[PDB]
Amino acid sequence: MATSDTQKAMAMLIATFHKYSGKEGDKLTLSKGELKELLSAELGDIFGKTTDKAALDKIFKDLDANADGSVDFQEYITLIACITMLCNEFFTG
Amino acid sequence: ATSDTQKAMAMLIATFHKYSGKEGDKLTLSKGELKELLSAELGDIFGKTTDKAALDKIFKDLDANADGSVDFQEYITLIACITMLCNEFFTGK
């Protein structure tokens, strides 16, 4: 029932988040380990395009602090967008 | 082909550029342009908001600073905000 490009894209991002968050527990958050697996499965084949290796490495490092904490949808979206801005030709040129 | 996460981000980039590729820097969107984008792309889910005041605040801020600009991160944060106020996955409605 998504009726615009933005709604279709958001539905895809929710569905991917839920594929990892929906196995058990609270569906509204990912564990740090669930998030690491998602990012590698969904974005791993563009990491090599990064314009800032240190910044991308820092992302996978910060997901080892608060190891027992959670990642909500806003934090997830922000990280996907950060990786996209480091790796996608629209922003890298 | 690419993952659904990459497909979704490519769609969000294309929509951002459709409104940002008219004037100035393609990497920023005026807040007045963003208002038009959000209304066209998400307007038909605004009746589902759990927090009308929160939705109204977004638009009040866009009207007050229509000539200011947002980057891609600020754009996707606002889309995620509205999605979390209106989409059943979050609202339970």
Side-chain angles (χ1 to χ4, degrees), chain B residues 24-75:
Chain B
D25 181 0
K26 80 173 184 177
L27 297 183
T28 62
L29 202 51
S30 82
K31 287 179 178 163
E33 291 165 343
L34 179 59
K35 175 186 173 175
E36 290 314 307
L37 187 162
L38 294 174
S39 300
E41 295 279 310
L42 297 169
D44 75 351
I45 75 175
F46 289 172
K48 303 188 206 177
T49 188
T50 53
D51 192 332
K52 167 62 161 148
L55 181 66
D56 285 343
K57 184 48 175 167
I58 292 169
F59 283 93
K60 182 172 185 171
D61 287 353
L62 296 180
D63 286 338
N65 189 214
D67 293 86
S69 66
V70 300
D71 65 21
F72 184 76
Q73 195 60 271
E74 288 169 312
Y75 155 82

mmCIF file of all heavy atoms in Angstrom, chain B residues 24-75:
data_model
loop_
_atom_site.group_PDB
_atom_site.id
_atom_site.type_symbol
_atom_site.label_atom_id
_atom_site.label_comp_id
_atom_site.label_asym_id
_atom_site.label_seq_id
_atom_site.Cartn_x
_atom_site.Cartn_y
_atom_site.Cartn_z
ATOM 1 N N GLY B 24 21.108 25.557 -7.532
ATOM 2 C CA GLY B 24 22.251 25.514 -6.640
ATOM 3 C C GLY B 24 22.884 24.139 -6.530
ATOM 4 O O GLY B 24 22.958 23.363 -7.490
ATOM 5 N N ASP B 25 23.344 23.837 -5.319
ATOM 6 C CA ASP B 25 24.099 22.619 -5.056
ATOM 7 C C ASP B 25 23.161 21.416 -5.071
ATOM 8 O O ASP B 25 22.134 21.414 -4.395
ATOM 9 C CB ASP B 25 24.760 22.752 -3.683
ATOM 10 C CG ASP B 25 25.612 21.546 -3.305
ATOM 11 O OD1 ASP B 25 25.714 20.587 -4.099
ATOM 12 O OD2 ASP B 25 26.185 21.567 -2.192
ATOM 13 N N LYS B 26 23.512 20.386 -5.845
ATOM 14 C CA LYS B 26 22.662 19.197 -5.865
ATOM 15 C C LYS B 26 22.661 18.468 -4.529
ATOM 16 O O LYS B 26 21.760 17.661 -4.279
ATOM 17 C CB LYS B 26 23.073 18.231 -6.979
ATOM 18 C CG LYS B 26 24.264 17.361 -6.630
ATOM 19 C CD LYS B 26 24.522 16.311 -7.697
ATOM 20 C CE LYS B 26 25.663 15.408 -7.271
ATOM 21 N NZ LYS B 26 25.935 14.310 -8.226
ATOM 22 N N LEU B 27 23.636 18.734 -3.669
ATOM 23 C CA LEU B 27 23.743 18.051 -2.388
ATOM 24 C C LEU B 27 22.927 18.701 -1.288
ATOM 25 O O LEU B 27 22.947 18.224 -0.147
ATOM 26 C CB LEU B 27 25.207 17.950 -1.964
ATOM 27 C CG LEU B 27 26.064 17.130 -2.918
ATOM 28 C CD1 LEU B 27 27.469 17.017 -2.373
ATOM 29 C CD2 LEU B 27 25.454 15.749 -3.133
ATOM 30 N N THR B 28 22.204 19.770 -1.586
ATOM 31 C CA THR B 28 21.319 20.360 -0.593
ATOM 32 C C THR B 28 19.974 20.695 -1.207
ATOM 33 O O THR B 28 19.820 20.892 -2.418
ATOM 34 C CB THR B 28 21.885 21.623 0.064
ATOM 35 O OG1 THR B 28 22.088 22.625 -0.935
ATOM 36 C CG2 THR B 28 23.210 21.330 0.772
ATOM 37 N N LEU B 29 19.004 20.784 -0.318
ATOM 38 C CA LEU B 29 17.623 21.030 -0.663
ATOM 39 C C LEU B 29 17.200 22.228 0.175
ATOM 40 O O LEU B 29 17.468 22.256 1.378
ATOM 41 C CB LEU B 29 16.832 19.792 -0.234
ATOM 42 C CG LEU B 29 15.487 19.421 -0.812
ATOM 43 C CD1 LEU B 29 15.561 19.420 -2.314
ATOM 44 C CD2 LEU B 29 15.163 18.007 -0.296
ATOM 45 N N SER B 30 16.533 23.201 -0.437
ATOM 46 C CA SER B 30 15.938 24.238 0.394
ATOM 47 C C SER B 30 14.800 23.647 1.220
ATOM 48 O O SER B 30 14.159 22.664 0.836
ATOM 49 C CB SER B 30 15.442 25.424 -0.456
ATOM 50 O OG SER B 30 14.172 25.170 -1.024
ATOM 51 N N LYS B 31 14.550 24.254 2.376
ATOM 52 C CA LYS B 31 13.483 23.734 3.217
ATOM 53 C C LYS B 31 12.124 23.914 2.562
ATOM 54 O O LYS B 31 11.224 23.106 2.806
ATOM 55 C CB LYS B 31 13.545 24.363 4.616
ATOM 56 C CG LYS B 31 14.715 23.823 5.441
ATOM 57 C CD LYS B 31 14.764 24.464 6.803
ATOM 58 C CE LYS B 31 15.897 23.876 7.642
ATOM 59 N NZ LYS B 31 16.162 24.785 8.781
ATOM 60 N N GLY B 32 11.945 24.954 1.735
ATOM 61 C CA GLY B 32 10.696 25.080 1.003
ATOM 62 C C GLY B 32 10.526 23.965 -0.011
ATOM 63 O O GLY B 32 9.416 23.474 -0.223
ATOM 64 N N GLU B 33 11.608 23.585 -0.682
ATOM 65 C CA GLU B 33 11.541 22.445 -1.597
ATOM 66 C C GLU B 33 11.262 21.162 -0.830
ATOM 67 O O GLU B 33 10.501 20.305 -1.290
ATOM 68 C CB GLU B 33 12.869 22.318 -2.350
ATOM 69 C CG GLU B 33 13.119 23.441 -3.345
ATOM 70 C CD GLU B 33 14.563 23.541 -3.828
ATOM 71 O OE1 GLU B 33 15.491 22.977 -3.213
ATOM 72 O OE2 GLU B 33 14.770 24.201 -4.863
ATOM 73 N N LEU B 34 11.891 21.011 0.332
ATOM 74 C CA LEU B 34 11.663 19.828 1.156
ATOM 75 C C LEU B 34 10.204 19.730 1.568
ATOM 76 O O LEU B 34 9.629 18.626 1.577
ATOM 77 C CB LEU B 34 12.557 19.853 2.404
ATOM 78 C CG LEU B 34 12.389 18.672 3.371
ATOM 79 C CD1 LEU B 34 12.679 17.348 2.674
ATOM 80 C CD2 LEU B 34 13.349 18.885 4.555
ATOM 81 N N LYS B 35 9.592 20.854 1.928
ATOM 82 C CA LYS B 35 8.172 20.853 2.268
ATOM 83 C C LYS B 35 7.341 20.297 1.109
ATOM 84 O O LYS B 35 6.439 19.475 1.321
ATOM 85 C CB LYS B 35 7.723 22.269 2.622
ATOM 86 C CG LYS B 35 6.221 22.376 2.872
ATOM 87 C CD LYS B 35 5.827 23.832 3.074
ATOM 88 C CE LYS B 35 4.320 23.978 3.156
ATOM 89 N NZ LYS B 35 3.928 25.353 3.477
ATOM 90 N N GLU B 36 7.630 20.732 -0.117
ATOM 91 C CA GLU B 36 6.887 20.227 -1.269
ATOM 92 C C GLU B 36 7.120 18.739 -1.445
ATOM 93 O O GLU B 36 6.174 17.989 -1.708
ATOM 94 C CB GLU B 36 7.276 20.984 -2.537
ATOM 95 C CG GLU B 36 6.772 22.434 -2.512
ATOM 96 C CD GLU B 36 5.310 22.529 -2.045
ATOM 97 O OE1 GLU B 36 4.440 21.823 -2.618
ATOM 98 O OE2 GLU B 36 5.034 23.294 -1.088
ATOM 99 N N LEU B 37 8.367 18.295 -1.272
ATOM 100 C CA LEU B 37 8.669 16.871 -1.413
ATOM 101 C C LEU B 37 7.897 16.059 -0.373
ATOM 102 O O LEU B 37 7.283 15.028 -0.699
ATOM 103 C CB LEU B 37 10.192 16.711 -1.237
ATOM 104 C CG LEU B 37 10.865 15.372 -1.487
ATOM 105 C CD1 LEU B 37 12.358 15.556 -1.690
ATOM 106 C CD2 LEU B 37 10.609 14.433 -0.296
ATOM 107 N N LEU B 38 7.953 16.470 0.885
ATOM 108 C CA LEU B 38 7.306 15.673 1.927
ATOM 109 C C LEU B 38 5.804 15.630 1.700
ATOM 110 O O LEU B 38 5.167 14.573 1.850
ATOM 111 C CB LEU B 38 7.604 16.281 3.291
ATOM 112 C CG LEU B 38 9.057 16.230 3.747
ATOM 113 C CD1 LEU B 38 9.158 17.017 5.064
ATOM 114 C CD2 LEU B 38 9.604 14.795 3.895
ATOM 115 N N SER B 39 5.202 16.760 1.335
ATOM 116 C CA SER B 39 3.760 16.763 1.105
ATOM 117 C C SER B 39 3.381 15.837 -0.039
ATOM 118 O O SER B 39 2.396 15.083 0.063
ATOM 119 C CB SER B 39 3.258 18.178 0.860
ATOM 120 O OG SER B 39 3.557 18.942 2.013
ATOM 121 N N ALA B 40 4.151 15.854 -1.140
ATOM 122 C CA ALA B 40 3.811 15.038 -2.301
ATOM 123 C C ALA B 40 4.099 13.570 -2.046
ATOM 124 O O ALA B 40 3.309 12.707 -2.434
ATOM 125 C CB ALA B 40 4.585 15.516 -3.532
ATOM 126 N N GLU B 41 5.212 13.278 -1.373
ATOM 127 C CA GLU B 41 5.651 11.887 -1.226
ATOM 128 C C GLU B 41 5.065 11.199 -0.012
ATOM 129 O O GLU B 41 4.973 9.962 -0.012
ATOM 130 C CB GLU B 41 7.179 11.832 -1.118
ATOM 131 C CG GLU B 41 7.911 12.281 -2.382
ATOM 132 C CD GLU B 41 7.977 11.177 -3.413
ATOM 133 O OE1 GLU B 41 8.378 10.030 -3.079
ATOM 134 O OE2 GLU B 41 7.615 11.396 -4.593
ATOM 135 N N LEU B 42 4.706 11.949 1.025
ATOM 136 C CA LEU B 42 4.185 11.361 2.255
ATOM 137 C C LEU B 42 2.823 11.887 2.672
ATOM 138 O O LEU B 42 2.246 11.355 3.637
ATOM 139 C CB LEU B 42 5.192 11.581 3.396
ATOM 140 C CG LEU B 42 6.541 10.899 3.167
ATOM 141 C CD1 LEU B 42 7.559 11.412 4.221
ATOM 142 C CD2 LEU B 42 6.454 9.390 3.173
ATOM 143 N N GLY B 43 2.268 12.870 1.948
ATOM 144 C CA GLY B 43 1.046 13.519 2.379
ATOM 145 C C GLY B 43 -0.117 12.584 2.581
ATOM 146 O O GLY B 43 -0.948 12.818 3.456
ATOM 147 N N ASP B 44 -0.173 11.494 1.816
ATOM 148 C CA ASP B 44 -1.332 10.624 1.912
ATOM 149 C C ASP B 44 -1.243 9.646 3.076
ATOM 150 O O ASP B 44 -2.162 8.843 3.260
ATOM 151 C CB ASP B 44 -1.657 9.974 0.556
ATOM 152 C CG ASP B 44 -0.717 8.866 0.193
ATOM 153 O OD1 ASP B 44 0.293 8.684 0.894
ATOM 154 O OD2 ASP B 44 -1.019 8.152 -0.796
ATOM 155 N N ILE B 45 -0.187 9.721 3.893
ATOM 156 C CA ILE B 45 -0.141 8.998 5.166
ATOM 157 C C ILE B 45 -0.226 9.912 6.380
ATOM 158 O O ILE B 45 -0.252 9.408 7.514
ATOM 159 C CB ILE B 45 1.060 8.036 5.278
ATOM 160 C CG1 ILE B 45 2.378 8.778 5.522
ATOM 161 C CG2 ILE B 45 1.104 7.144 4.061
ATOM 162 C CD1 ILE B 45 3.581 7.810 5.756
ATOM 163 N N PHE B 46 -0.313 11.238 6.184
ATOM 164 C CA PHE B 46 -0.324 12.139 7.335
ATOM 165 C C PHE B 46 -1.549 11.931 8.231
ATOM 166 O O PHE B 46 -1.488 12.231 9.425
ATOM 167 C CB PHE B 46 -0.314 13.598 6.877
ATOM 168 C CG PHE B 46 0.989 14.078 6.285
ATOM 169 C CD1 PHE B 46 1.020 15.330 5.695
ATOM 170 C CD2 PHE B 46 2.173 13.319 6.317
ATOM 171 C CE1 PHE B 46 2.188 15.816 5.133
ATOM 172 C CE2 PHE B 46 3.354 13.797 5.739
ATOM 173 C CZ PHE B 46 3.342 15.054 5.146
ATOM 174 N N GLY B 47 -2.677 11.462 7.684
ATOM 175 C CA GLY B 47 -3.857 11.179 8.492
ATOM 176 C C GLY B 47 -3.695 10.026 9.460
ATOM 177 O O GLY B 47 -4.577 9.811 10.292
ATOM 178 N N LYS B 48 -2.591 9.295 9.375
ATOM 179 C CA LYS B 48 -2.320 8.188 10.272
ATOM 180 C C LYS B 48 -1.407 8.571 11.437
ATOM 181 O O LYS B 48 -1.113 7.710 12.281
ATOM 182 C CB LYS B 48 -1.682 7.052 9.469
ATOM 183 C CG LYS B 48 -2.519 6.577 8.281
ATOM 184 C CD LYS B 48 -1.905 5.324 7.667
ATOM 185 C CE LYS B 48 -2.260 5.180 6.196
ATOM 186 N NZ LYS B 48 -1.600 3.989 5.594
ATOM 187 N N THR B 49 -0.996 9.831 11.541
ATOM 188 C CA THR B 49 -0.029 10.205 12.569
ATOM 189 C C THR B 49 -0.557 9.947 13.980
ATOM 190 O O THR B 49 -1.724 10.202 14.288
ATOM 191 C CB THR B 49 0.413 11.655 12.435
ATOM 192 O OG1 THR B 49 1.498 11.902 13.359
ATOM 193 C CG2 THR B 49 -0.731 12.608 12.722
ATOM 194 N N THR B 50 0.335 9.434 14.832
ATOM 195 C CA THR B 50 0.056 9.299 16.258
ATOM 196 C C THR B 50 0.259 10.600 17.009
ATOM 197 O O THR B 50 -0.147 10.697 18.178
ATOM 198 C CB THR B 50 0.953 8.213 16.878
ATOM 199 O OG1 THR B 50 2.339 8.474 16.578
ATOM 200 C CG2 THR B 50 0.568 6.897 16.355
ATOM 201 N N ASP B 51 0.883 11.586 16.384
ATOM 202 C CA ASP B 51 1.234 12.828 17.066
ATOM 203 C C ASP B 51 1.065 13.943 16.034
ATOM 204 O O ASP B 51 2.000 14.262 15.293
ATOM 205 C CB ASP B 51 2.656 12.754 17.624
ATOM 206 C CG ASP B 51 2.975 13.885 18.590
ATOM 207 O OD1 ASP B 51 2.382 14.973 18.475
ATOM 208 O OD2 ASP B 51 3.843 13.691 19.466
ATOM 209 N N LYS B 52 -0.134 14.537 16.004
ATOM 210 C CA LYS B 52 -0.393 15.623 15.067
ATOM 211 C C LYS B 52 0.487 16.825 15.374
ATOM 212 O O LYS B 52 0.955 17.510 14.459
ATOM 213 C CB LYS B 52 -1.884 15.983 15.079
ATOM 214 C CG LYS B 52 -2.346 17.297 14.403
ATOM 215 C CD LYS B 52 -2.057 17.375 12.884
ATOM 216 C CE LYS B 52 -2.948 18.455 12.212
ATOM 217 N NZ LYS B 52 -2.326 19.177 11.005
ATOM 218 N N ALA B 53 0.720 17.102 16.660
ATOM 219 C CA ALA B 53 1.565 18.239 17.007
ATOM 220 C C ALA B 53 2.982 18.045 16.492
ATOM 221 O O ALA B 53 3.616 18.996 16.033
ATOM 222 C CB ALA B 53 1.576 18.463 18.520
ATOM 223 N N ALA B 54 3.494 16.816 16.548
ATOM 224 C CA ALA B 54 4.840 16.566 16.042
ATOM 225 C C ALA B 54 4.904 16.759 14.531
ATOM 226 O O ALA B 54 5.850 17.361 14.004
ATOM 227 C CB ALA B 54 5.270 15.149 16.426
ATOM 228 N N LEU B 55 3.883 16.298 13.822
ATOM 229 C CA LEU B 55 3.831 16.517 12.382
ATOM 230 C C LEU B 55 3.748 17.997 12.074
ATOM 231 O O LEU B 55 4.428 18.494 11.166
ATOM 232 C CB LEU B 55 2.612 15.797 11.811
ATOM 233 C CG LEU B 55 2.433 15.910 10.297
ATOM 234 C CD1 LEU B 55 3.582 15.179 9.619
ATOM 235 C CD2 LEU B 55 1.082 15.337 9.877
ATOM 236 N N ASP B 56 2.923 18.730 12.828
ATOM 237 C CA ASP B 56 2.761 20.159 12.580
ATOM 238 C C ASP B 56 4.059 20.913 12.825
ATOM 239 O O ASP B 56 4.365 21.866 12.107
ATOM 240 C CB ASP B 56 1.626 20.735 13.423
ATOM 241 C CG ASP B 56 0.249 20.358 12.897
ATOM 242 O OD1 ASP B 56 0.159 19.928 11.716
ATOM 243 O OD2 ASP B 56 -0.733 20.507 13.654
ATOM 244 N N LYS B 57 4.825 20.502 13.849
ATOM 245 C CA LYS B 57 6.083 21.178 14.160
ATOM 246 C C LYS B 57 7.058 21.100 12.995
ATOM 247 O O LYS B 57 7.758 22.083 12.694
ATOM 248 C CB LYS B 57 6.691 20.576 15.430
ATOM 249 C CG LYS B 57 7.970 21.264 15.901
ATOM 250 C CD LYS B 57 7.809 22.773 15.935
ATOM 251 C CE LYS B 57 9.041 23.450 16.533
ATOM 252 N NZ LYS B 57 9.047 24.931 16.307
ATOM 253 N N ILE B 58 7.127 19.947 12.330
ATOM 254 C CA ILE B 58 8.003 19.808 11.171
ATOM 255 C C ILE B 58 7.664 20.868 10.132
ATOM 256 O O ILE B 58 8.537 21.588 9.635
ATOM 257 C CB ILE B 58 7.880 18.394 10.589
ATOM 258 C CG1 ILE B 58 8.479 17.391 11.589
ATOM 259 C CG2 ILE B 58 8.485 18.334 9.171
ATOM 260 C CD1 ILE B 58 8.193 15.973 11.247
ATOM 261 N N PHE B 59 6.375 21.010 9.822
ATOM 262 C CA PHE B 59 5.958 21.959 8.794
ATOM 263 C C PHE B 59 6.101 23.412 9.247
ATOM 264 O O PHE B 59 6.452 24.277 8.433
ATOM 265 C CB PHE B 59 4.552 21.609 8.313
ATOM 266 C CG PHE B 59 4.568 20.448 7.377
ATOM 267 C CD1 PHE B 59 4.378 19.163 7.829
ATOM 268 C CD2 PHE B 59 4.831 20.658 6.038
ATOM 269 C CE1 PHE B 59 4.447 18.102 6.957
ATOM 270 C CE2 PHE B 59 4.891 19.607 5.167
ATOM 271 C CZ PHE B 59 4.690 18.328 5.627
ATOM 272 N N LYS B 60 5.824 23.704 10.524
ATOM 273 C CA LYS B 60 6.045 25.049 11.039
ATOM 274 C C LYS B 60 7.505 25.457 10.876
ATOM 275 O O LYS B 60 7.803 26.593 10.477
ATOM 276 C CB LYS B 60 5.602 25.111 12.506
ATOM 277 C CG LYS B 60 5.750 26.475 13.139
ATOM 278 C CD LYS B 60 5.105 26.500 14.510
ATOM 279 C CE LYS B 60 5.155 27.908 15.098
ATOM 280 N NZ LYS B 60 4.331 28.001 16.332
ATOM 281 N N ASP B 61 8.424 24.526 11.130
ATOM 282 C CA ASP B 61 9.851 24.823 11.006
ATOM 283 C C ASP B 61 10.250 25.015 9.549
ATOM 284 O O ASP B 61 11.022 25.930 9.223
ATOM 285 C CB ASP B 61 10.661 23.699 11.649
ATOM 286 C CG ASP B 61 10.582 23.730 13.181
ATOM 287 O OD1 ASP B 61 10.007 24.699 13.744
ATOM 288 O OD2 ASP B 61 11.098 22.780 13.818
ATOM 289 N N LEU B 62 9.700 24.198 8.648
ATOM 290 C CA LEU B 62 9.988 24.374 7.225
ATOM 291 C C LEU B 62 9.473 25.709 6.716
ATOM 292 O O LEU B 62 10.142 26.367 5.915
ATOM 293 C CB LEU B 62 9.401 23.212 6.414
ATOM 294 C CG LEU B 62 10.030 21.847 6.742
ATOM 295 C CD1 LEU B 62 9.365 20.769 5.883
ATOM 296 C CD2 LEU B 62 11.533 21.831 6.504
ATOM 297 N N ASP B 63 8.288 26.143 7.174
ATOM 298 C CA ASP B 63 7.756 27.440 6.730
ATOM 299 C C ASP B 63 8.567 28.607 7.270
ATOM 300 O O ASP B 63 8.772 29.611 6.568
ATOM 301 C CB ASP B 63 6.300 27.586 7.173
ATOM 302 C CG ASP B 63 5.364 26.729 6.354
ATOM 303 O OD1 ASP B 63 5.738 26.369 5.228
ATOM 304 O OD2 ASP B 63 4.229 26.457 6.807
ATOM 305 N N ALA B 64 9.028 28.502 8.512
ATOM 306 C CA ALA B 64 9.763 29.619 9.102
ATOM 307 C C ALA B 64 11.112 29.834 8.431
ATOM 308 O O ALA B 64 11.580 30.977 8.339
ATOM 309 C CB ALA B 64 9.943 29.378 10.598
ATOM 310 N N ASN B 65 11.754 28.764 7.945
ATOM 311 C CA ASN B 65 13.107 28.856 7.394
ATOM 312 C C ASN B 65 13.127 28.279 5.988
ATOM 313 O O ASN B 65 14.023 27.528 5.622
ATOM 314 C CB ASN B 65 14.128 28.147 8.310
ATOM 315 C CG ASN B 65 15.630 28.391 7.903
ATOM 316 O OD1 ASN B 65 16.510 27.490 8.061
ATOM 317 N ND2 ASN B 65 15.926 29.567 7.418
ATOM 318 N N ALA B 66 12.138 28.654 5.170
ATOM 319 C CA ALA B 66 11.994 28.064 3.831
ATOM 320 C C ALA B 66 13.234 28.258 2.956
ATOM 321 O O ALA B 66 13.522 27.426 2.089
ATOM 322 C CB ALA B 66 10.769 28.671 3.144
ATOM 323 N N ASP B 67 14.012 29.314 3.182
ATOM 324 C CA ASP B 67 15.181 29.567 2.358
ATOM 325 C C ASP B 67 16.446 28.916 2.899
ATOM 326 O O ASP B 67 17.478 28.911 2.209
ATOM 327 C CB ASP B 67 15.352 31.082 2.175
ATOM 328 C CG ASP B 67 14.222 31.675 1.337
ATOM 329 O OD1 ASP B 67 13.156 32.024 1.886
ATOM 330 O OD2 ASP B 67 14.378 31.739 0.108
ATOM 331 N N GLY B 68 16.389 28.334 4.092
ATOM 332 C CA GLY B 68 17.489 27.544 4.589
ATOM 333 C C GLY B 68 17.574 26.231 3.864
ATOM 334 O O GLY B 68 16.699 25.864 3.084
ATOM 335 N N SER B 69 18.627 25.489 4.145
ATOM 336 C CA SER B 69 18.838 24.257 3.398
ATOM 337 C C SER B 69 19.082 23.071 4.318
ATOM 338 O O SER B 69 19.471 23.216 5.479
ATOM 339 C CB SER B 69 20.012 24.409 2.450
ATOM 340 O OG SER B 69 21.217 24.571 3.175
ATOM 341 N N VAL B 70 18.856 21.873 3.761
ATOM 342 C CA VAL B 70 19.143 20.617 4.445
ATOM 343 C C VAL B 70 20.024 19.765 3.551
ATOM 344 O O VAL B 70 19.991 19.873 2.319
ATOM 345 C CB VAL B 70 17.908 19.787 4.877
ATOM 346 C CG1 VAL B 70 17.030 20.597 5.857
ATOM 347 C CG2 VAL B 70 17.109 19.335 3.650
ATOM 348 N N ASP B 71 20.819 18.915 4.186
ATOM 349 C CA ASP B 71 21.602 17.927 3.454
ATOM 350 C C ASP B 71 20.856 16.590 3.427
ATOM 351 O O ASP B 71 19.734 16.458 3.912
ATOM 352 C CB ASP B 71 23.039 17.837 3.981
ATOM 353 C CG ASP B 71 23.137 17.331 5.419
ATOM 354 O OD1 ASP B 71 22.209 16.683 5.920
ATOM 355 O OD2 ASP B 71 24.176 17.593 6.070
ATOM 356 N N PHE B 72 21.494 15.577 2.834
ATOM 357 C CA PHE B 72 20.807 14.299 2.663
ATOM 358 C C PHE B 72 20.505 13.642 4.009
ATOM 359 O O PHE B 72 19.474 12.984 4.173
ATOM 360 C CB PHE B 72 21.664 13.374 1.777
ATOM 361 C CG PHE B 72 21.008 12.042 1.453
ATOM 362 C CD1 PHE B 72 19.993 11.972 0.499
ATOM 363 C CD2 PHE B 72 21.392 10.886 2.107
ATOM 364 C CE1 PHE B 72 19.386 10.778 0.200
ATOM 365 C CE2 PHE B 72 20.785 9.658 1.807
ATOM 366 C CZ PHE B 72 19.777 9.622 0.847
ATOM 367 N N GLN B 73 21.416 13.775 4.965
ATOM 368 C CA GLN B 73 21.198 13.174 6.276
ATOM 369 C C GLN B 73 19.989 13.791 6.967
ATOM 370 O O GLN B 73 19.167 13.074 7.553
ATOM 371 C CB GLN B 73 22.468 13.350 7.109
ATOM 372 C CG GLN B 73 22.576 12.510 8.346
ATOM 373 C CD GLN B 73 22.530 11.024 8.032
ATOM 374 O OE1 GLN B 73 21.456 10.438 7.984
ATOM 375 N NE2 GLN B 73 23.695 10.413 7.811
ATOM 376 N N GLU B 74 19.857 15.122 6.911
ATOM 377 C CA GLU B 74 18.734 15.806 7.539
ATOM 378 C C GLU B 74 17.426 15.429 6.858
ATOM 379 O O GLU B 74 16.397 15.226 7.521
ATOM 380 C CB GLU B 74 18.983 17.329 7.493
ATOM 381 C CG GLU B 74 20.071 17.779 8.449
ATOM 382 C CD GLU B 74 20.534 19.222 8.241
ATOM 383 O OE1 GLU B 74 20.805 19.629 7.082
ATOM 384 O OE2 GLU B 74 20.620 19.952 9.256
ATOM 385 N N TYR B 75 17.463 15.301 5.530
ATOM 386 C CA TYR B 75 16.319 14.852 4.741
ATOM 387 C C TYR B 75 15.875 13.450 5.138
ATOM 388 O O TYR B 75 14.689 13.231 5.398
ATOM 389 C CB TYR B 75 16.762 14.905 3.276
ATOM 390 C CG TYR B 75 16.082 13.999 2.270
ATOM 391 C CD1 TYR B 75 14.852 14.353 1.711
ATOM 392 C CD2 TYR B 75 16.725 12.871 1.776
ATOM 393 C CE1 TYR B 75 14.252 13.567 0.726
ATOM 394 C CE2 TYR B 75 16.134 12.066 0.795
ATOM 395 C CZ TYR B 75 14.899 12.420 0.263
ATOM 396 O OH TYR B 75 14.358 11.626 -0.738
#
